[PDB]
């Protein structure tokens, strides 16, 4: 029993984290085989930030301009290139701790673990979701750029986020590991602002299933709703539309608990319209939306890595 915000074991990723310094600017990099991946804004002086031309700033650098430190070992950079908003520093040594891995670009609403790092040293691990507006609600200070987000499947680490920057509202923006930003954001000092965010409906439903699995039924009712009618209430409360695909994804959890997806939707509609009346669900007084259906199956059934 119990239900926690649960991150993947971070060990496979810890062994990949390094420090990258260029001039007076330092941040973290990701060492896989003989390549170190990091945010390209490492090559930027603060004076370069309002409208950087990175192709220009990079042609002006040499391999020796990049200091890569793996613990207490300097790695020598033997080559460099830009791919989108990430730098790839080729180094003389392959990482002997390179896990089995892939790079994936996730969809909004998907969750991942973040290994927050400073000076190439891991500091903490937490879970978060890619918001519908393509920000993440992370926990990041100066120095944390280059920390990565990931999921683990068996022994394969799927990297899906590299951290770059913090927006004025205190939420976070970054790229996939091939350097493409999530959302409309650019690695320039400019006015940029997240689009208005929405609640991830399919995740809220999954978490209500998690609550049922853990013995909490107070919010259930005997009504059903139609998809169309539920989606009408969703839009009024700033919830993402629920699709037939979402319904299908929630299939396994509906099956385990015997609660039809559309019946759970009637529960959620009541919760949206009436509040919680001083009650909690899995220890929250808010409707939680950063557990995917997969997260719930993973934790209520006990899958390992």
């Amino acid at each position: 029993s119990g239900f926690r915000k649960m991150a993947f074991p971070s060990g496979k990723v810890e062994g990949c984290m390094v420090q990258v310094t260029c001039g007076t600017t330092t941040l973290n990099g990701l060492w896989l085989d003989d390549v170190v991946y990091c945010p390209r804004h490492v090559i930027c002086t603060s004076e370069d930030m309002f409208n950087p031309n990175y192709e220009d700033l990079l042609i002006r650098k040499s391999n020796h301009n990049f200091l890569v430190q793996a613990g207490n070992v300097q790695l020598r950079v033997i080559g460099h290139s830009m791919q989108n908003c990430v730098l790839k520093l080729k180094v003389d040594t392959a990482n002997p701790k390179t896990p089995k891995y892939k790079f994936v670009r996730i969809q909004p609403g998907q969750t991942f673990s973040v290994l927050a790092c400073y000076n190439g040293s891991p500091s903490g691990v937490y879970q978060c979701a890619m918001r519908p507006n393509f920000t993440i609600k992370g926990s990041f200070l100066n120095g944390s750029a280059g920390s990565v987000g990931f999921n683990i499947d068996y022994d394969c680490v799927s990297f899906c986020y590299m951290h770059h920057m913090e927006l004025p509202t205190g939420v976070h923006a970054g790229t996939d590991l091939e350097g493409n930003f999530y959302g409309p954001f650019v690695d320039r000092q400019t006015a940029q602002a997240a689009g208005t965010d929405t609640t991830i409906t399919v995740n809220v439903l999954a978490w209500l299933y998690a609550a049922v699995i853990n013995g909490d039924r107070w919010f259930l009712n005997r009504f059903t709703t139609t998809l169309n009618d539920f989606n009408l209430v969703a839009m009024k409360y700033n919830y993402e539309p629920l699709t037939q695909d979402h319904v299908d994804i929630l299939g396994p959890l509906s099956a385990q608990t015997g609660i039809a997806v559309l019946d759970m939707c009637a529960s959620l509609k009541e919760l949206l319209q009436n509040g919680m009346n001083g009650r909690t669900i899995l220890g929250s007084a808010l409707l939680e939306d950063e557990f995917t259906p997969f997260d719930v199956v993973r934790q209520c059934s006990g899958v390992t890595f």
């Binding site: 600017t25 120095g143 770059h164 400019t190």
Partner: peptide, 10 residues
């Protein structure tokens, strides 16, 4: 008002 790039100064 502005984005903060979260590198650090060495």
């Amino acid at each position: 008002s502005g984005v903060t790039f979260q590198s650090a100064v060495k």
